[PDB]
Design a protein around this ligand. Structure first.
Ligand SMILES: O=S(=O)(O)CCNC(CO)(CO)CO
Lengths: 219, 219
């Protein structure tokens, strides 16, 4: 019943410093190392370093010396990593893990997102056919949900009554703002004769936006 | 440092099949102390990694008996005797012999199905978006298999690479297909300097790209 419990998601401005914690339970803290690992989209896993609590001993990956600092408090059984001079390259999920003869137990991970953006609701743009094309027997519609902060929107297509047919494309952070998209495919008998709507909720701005899908030009 | 070359990148299987995954470090992993710190992990979407095998061949507590590891020198192998649904996800190896510790790039164990060509849908910028001076052109490439796909944008027949955002879904639980969304963002000004906008999808199911296009003048 070894458990490593990390601190919560962080939203940080560039140039700031953040401290992530890792509270160890279920074993003797000074007996194992704590490892720190970085999980960045499009990169895989990158080891930052390790600390042996109570011993004064650390090993850092060279490029993190000067950037990451590990401490460990044997009174509270908590390990900490400080990352300074935060940049866009630091947006990632960070894990702590136990180490000694394998990374045998991992924390749940802490998301750090680096951005100058304020809470910004998304712009929601309809994606519907036009351009004088002839619709087939099925039509694909979409909504582009662009320029929001921070994460998590939900797109619902008319209340949920699809039996999807719906694809949700994971958001990407670019230049400090998120963008995602969502598509649905409907029979041509249903659209544009009947209403198709995308409902986009962004709890962090307490906003919900509904866009009715209409042809973008002659069909 | 020690590079961990893991193969294959993608391992399609039918449930019940054997699976084998290879990790080749760029040098020996035998520590001065005699131990070989080569380990295997499984990570499921939105979960932390979990240990499977430690020090080459030792099965971690709670790990199913169908997992085993073996190997020596610069060739190590994780074997799954019969793939079950709980085994799908991303596998990686780690070495803990040489600082900095390093990880393999991952192997996605996924479900094998018949190849499927993408359904490709292109959309010009929303009137709503152009009003704000922005212009995002969207291409959905839906319900294809295998996952490997490449999207190329052309503007008036010329390839364009910067300002492109791509997002992929994980394998569909019902279809076993993949989908992807590609978004080309330009300024409204730039968008108006050109007519023909094209997304081209290169995928196993064609020796030639599936091309979708429109001309701004007619949309
Ligand atoms: O195998 S791991 O759990 O990734 C760390 C092993 N570290 C040691 C450090 O001296 C071997 O190099 C053993 O404790």
């Amino acid at each position: 019943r070894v458990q490593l419990l990390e601190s919560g998601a962080e939203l940080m401005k560039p140039g700031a410093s953040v401290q992530i914690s890792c509270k160890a339970t279920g074993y003797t803290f000074s007996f194992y190392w704590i490892e720190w690992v970085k999980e960045r989209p499009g990169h895989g896993l990158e080891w930052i370093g390790e600390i042996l609590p109570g011993s004064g001993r650390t090993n850092y990956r060279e490029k993190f010396k000067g950037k990451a600092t590990f401490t460990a408090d044997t009174s509270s059984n908590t390990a900490y990593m400080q990352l300074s001079s935060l940049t866009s390259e630091d947006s990632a999920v960070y894990y702590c893990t136990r180490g000694y003869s394998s990374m045998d137990y991992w924390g749940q991970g802490t998301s750090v997102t680096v951005s100058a953006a304020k809470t910004t609701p998304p712009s929601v743009y309809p994606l519907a056919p036009g351009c004088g094309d002839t619709t087939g027997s099925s039509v694909t519609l979409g909504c582009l949900v662009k320029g929001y902060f921070p994460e998590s929107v939900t797109v619902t297509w008319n209340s949920g009554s699809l039996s999807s047919s719906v694809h949700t494309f994971p958001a990407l952070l670019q230049s400090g703002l998120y963008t995602m998209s969502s598509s649905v495919t409907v029979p041509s008998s249903t659209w544009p004769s009947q209403t198709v709507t995308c409902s986009v909720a962004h709890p962090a701005s307490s906003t919900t936006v509904d866009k009715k899908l209409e042809p973008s030009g002659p069909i | 440092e020690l590079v961990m070359t893991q193969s294959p990148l993608s391992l399609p299987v039918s449930l019940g099949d054997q699976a084998s995954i290879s990790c080749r470090p760029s040098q020996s992993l035998v520590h001065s102390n005699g131990n070989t710190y080569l380990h295997w992990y499984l990570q499921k979407p939105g979960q932390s990694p979990k240990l499977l095998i430690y020090r080459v061949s030792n099965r971690f507590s709670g790990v199913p008996d169908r997992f085993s590891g073996s190997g020596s020198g610069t060739a190590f192998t994780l074997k799954i005797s019969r793939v079950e649904a709980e085994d799908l996800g991303v596998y990686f190896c780690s070495q803990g012999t040489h600082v900095p510790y390093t990880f393999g790039g991952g192997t996605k164990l996924e479900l094998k199905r018949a190849d499927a060509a993408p359904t490709v849908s292109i959309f010009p910028p929303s009137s709503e978006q152009l009003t704000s001076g922005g212009a995002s052109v969207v291409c959905f490439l839906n319900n294809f298999y295998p996952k490997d796909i490449n999207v190329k944008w052309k503007i008036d027949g010329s390839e364009r690479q910067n300002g492109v955002l791509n997002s992929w879904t994980d394998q569909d639980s019902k279809d076993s297909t993949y989908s992807m969304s590609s978004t080309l963002t330009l300024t409204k000004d730039e968008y108006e300097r050109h007519n023909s906008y094209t997304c081209e999808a290169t995928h196993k199911t064609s020796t030639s790209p599936i091309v979708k296009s429109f001309n701004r003048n007619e949309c």
